[PDB]
Amino acid sequence: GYVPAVVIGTGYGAAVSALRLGEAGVQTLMLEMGQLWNQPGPDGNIFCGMLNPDKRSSWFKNRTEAPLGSFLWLDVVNRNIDPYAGVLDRVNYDQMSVYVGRGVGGGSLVNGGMAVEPKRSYFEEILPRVDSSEMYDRYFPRANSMLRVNHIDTKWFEDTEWYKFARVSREQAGKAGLGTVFVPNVYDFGYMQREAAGEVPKSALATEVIYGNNHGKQSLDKTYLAAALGTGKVTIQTLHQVKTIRQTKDGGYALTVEQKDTDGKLLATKEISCRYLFLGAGSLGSTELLVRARDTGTLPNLNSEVGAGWGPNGNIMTARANHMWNPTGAHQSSIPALGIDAWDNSDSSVFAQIAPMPAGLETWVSLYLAITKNPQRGTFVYDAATDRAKLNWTRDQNAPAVNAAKALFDRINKANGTIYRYDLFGTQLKAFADDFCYHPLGGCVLGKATDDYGRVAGYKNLYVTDGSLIPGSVGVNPFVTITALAERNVERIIKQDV
Ligand SMILES: Cc1cc2nc3c(=O)[nH]c(=O)nc-3n(C[C@H](O)[C@H](O)[C@H](O)COP(=O)(O)OP(=O)(O)OC[C@H]3O[C@@H](n4cnc5c(N)ncnc54)[C@H](O)[C@@H]3O)c2cc1C
């Protein structure tokens, strides 16, 4: 029942932490509520694609859903399903829906693989207490290398039909005096070229991403987690969800963990104790565990900052209708490669990802996922009645985000004589999706709810390592920052505490 170190979750913060702990000789147990995705399903594949969604696509839902922005073309493939331990979870709060991965590797299993370093000037603005030289000289480079970030071949990108959708938006943005930038990725671009050449099994070129990629994507299970297990000091137990956390009579930590099967049936409740406890359950998971512990009195010394400072990384989705002479293509790589960088740290800052659409036929639609600078923050409040942390965030709090996104795309529409699509997110004439989030950030902010390295305030040997540490915004796709920060944190923690 005892293990020196326990890491809750297997996402970015968790993976980095477990690898370094293992390398330092600390026997570590990782607890993951989702599945280890390595068994072929009904179609001979581990994951289901976006055009053939089944129970594997969702975390305990009774019906599949179309990827945001593609309901008009993909609802036709939606089917009723048995609640199952699927890979993608849509967590619905009062006025916000947060998408998170569930499985060994966490969000790395379902994300777009976009590996982007935040602008240094912005990093220094959001985390002034952190030494930025150390982050850019050592931690970002280390994260880049271990994550296996790579770059797309420009010649191939320019010629391939699979990225015509990206080229169309580049041309359109150019007329408004806006340039584009290549987005590094963990998806093997060399493999992607071979897919287009019909030399290897297609994944990104076979409408796969949001429910996992059967090939090509260097998710954490192949990188950090593989290395962690390789140390001989790390083990991973799946379908194990931590419910409570308390401090033992001697300073260690005890956890109640529920083991379930893939159908969600409770198989057993175990008691696991440790000397060092690392939380890597994500922005939602780690914050909920802490607000629960504080409010139920199992960790009575947690401060008032626990639960505060949450932000959706200013996530806003919108789309533009192209002229008939600017078709985006029926064949679109599921992995984005280009983005529009209009981020100058001001309130009008927008870094938008040119997103592909899975329809498989010509729709003339250009889809974009904008990351904005919105000061609004939400707070996770514990509800003792349902034993769930509720996110206090209202839709109108995304107004500044919508405004920033709209001002940028209005410029592109004006320069091209194009208009927005208003029917992609429902039948209510909404050109901007403002109640979804792929990048949850905050809840246990670094330096507020914890010290500058993630040590939870009020406790010893208790650490938070994931996206809950970030103060609601990074101005870019978040995983590289979470990874780099985790490298910085665990290295210091092992040196001084272990
Ligand atoms: C569709 C989609 C697209 C995205 N695209 C990108 C992109 O291209 N680039 C980018 O930078 N970011 C992207 N992201 C966001 C990125 O995936 C997340 O920011 C990142 O995965 C967060 O890492 P984390 O370590 O905080 O937590 P997560 O990766 O979320 O991992 C948390 C893990 O903890 C497990 N866990 C939860 N609670 C418990 C519990 N109580 N007990 C046990 N285990 C638990 C979860 O099941 C999970 O496996 C996207 C996310 C989604 C949903």
Give the CATH number of the domain where residue 454 resides: 3.50.50.60
Decide: 251 and 461 in contact? Cβ < 8 Å. Answer: yes
> Do 111 and 186 fall into the same domain?
no
> Do 303 and 345 fall into the same domain?
no
> Do 60 and 159 fall into the same domain?
no
Q: Kindly report the CATH number assigned to the domain that includes residue 428.
A: 3.30.410.10
Residue in the structure block whose two tokens are 């001979």: 44
Handedness of CA 94, 97, 102, 106 (dihedral sign): negative
- Count structural domains, the chain: 2
> Measuring from atom 9 of ligand 1, which residue has the nearest CA?
114
Nearest to 59, CA basis, from 13, 100, 111, 15: 100
> Measuring from atom 39 of ligand 1, which residue has the nearest CA?
281
β-strands 240-247, 234-237 pairing: unpaired
451-473 burial, b if ≥16 CB within 10 A, otherwise e? eebbbbbbbebbbbbbbbbbbbb
Distance (angstroms) between ligand 1 centre and the Cα of 256 equals 22
For residue 486, which atom of ligand 1 is closest to its CA? 25
Distance (angstroms) between ligand 1 centre and the Cα of 311 equals 15
> Measuring from atom 24 of ligand 1, which residue has the nearest CA?
282
Distance (angstroms) between ligand 1 centre and the Cα of 89 equals 10
Number of H helices, E strands in the chain: 12, 20
Residue whose CB lies within 8 A of the most ligand 1 atoms, among 16, 30, 33, for a mutation test: 33
One-letter amino acid identity for 491? E
> Do 476 and 447 fall into the same domain?
yes
> Do 287 and 389 fall into the same domain?
yes
Distance (angstroms) between ligand 1 centre and the Cα of 102 equals 8
Give the residue numbers spanning the domain of 423.
Answer: 148-205+315-376+398-434
Q: How many residues does the chain have?
A: 498
For residue 103, which atom of ligand 1 is closest to its CA? 49
Distance (angstroms) between ligand 1 centre and the Cα of 367 equals 22
Q: What span, in angstroms and rounded, lies between the C-alpha atoms of 483 and 14?
A: 9
Q: What phi and psi, each to the nearest 5 degrees, are found at residue 259?
A: -100, 130
Distance (angstroms) between ligand 1 centre and the Cα of 176 equals 35
Structure tokens at 44: 């001979």
Decide: 95 and 394 in contact? Cβ < 8 Å. Answer: yes
For residue 9, which atom of ligand 1 is closest to its CA? 34
Distance (angstroms) between ligand 1 centre and the Cα of 457 equals 24
Per the entry, the structure determination technique was X-ray
> Measuring from atom 17 of ligand 1, which residue has the nearest CA?
107
Distance (angstroms) between ligand 1 centre and the Cα of 252 equals 27
> Do 303 and 335 fall into the same domain?
no
For residue 84, give every residue at least 6 positions away whose Cβ sits within 8 Å of its Cβ, in sequence order, or none. Answer: 55, 56, 58, 60, 262, 263, 264
Residue whose CB lies within 8 A of the most ligand 1 atoms, among 269, 479, 480, 482, for a mutation test: 479
Nearest to 372, CA basis, from 443, 430, 318: 318
Q: What span, in angstroms and rounded, lies between the C-alpha atoms of 48 and 73?
A: 17
Distance (angstroms) between ligand 1 centre and the Cα of 108 equals 6
One-letter amino acid identity for 439? H
What distance separates the 2 farthest-apart alpha carbons in the chain? 71
> Do 126 and 180 fall into the same domain?
no
DSSP state of 287: H
Q: Which residues is 437 bridged to in the sheet?
A: 98
Find the residues whose C-beta lies inside 6 A of ligand 1. 8-14, 31-34, 99-103, 106-108, 110-114, 210, 241-242, 280-283, 285, 289, 438-439, 466-467, 477-479, 482
For residue 51, give every residue at least 6 positions away whose Cβ sits within 8 Å of its Cβ, in sequence order, or none. Answer: 74, 77, 207, 358, 360
> Do 325 and 197 fall into the same domain?
yes
Q: What phi and psi, each to the nearest 5 degrees, are found at residue 300?
A: -60, -20
> Do 201 and 218 fall into the same domain?
no
> Do 30 and 177 fall into the same domain?
no
Q: Which residues is 388 bridged to in the sheet?
A: 383
> Do 26 and 134 fall into the same domain?
yes
Cα torsion for 120, 125, 131, 134, to the nearest 10°?
Answer: -10
Experimental resolution (Å): 1.6
> Do 356 and 489 fall into the same domain?
no
**Per-residue DSSP letters for 3-44?**
-SEEEE--SHHHHHHHHHHHHTT--EEEE-SSB---S--TTS
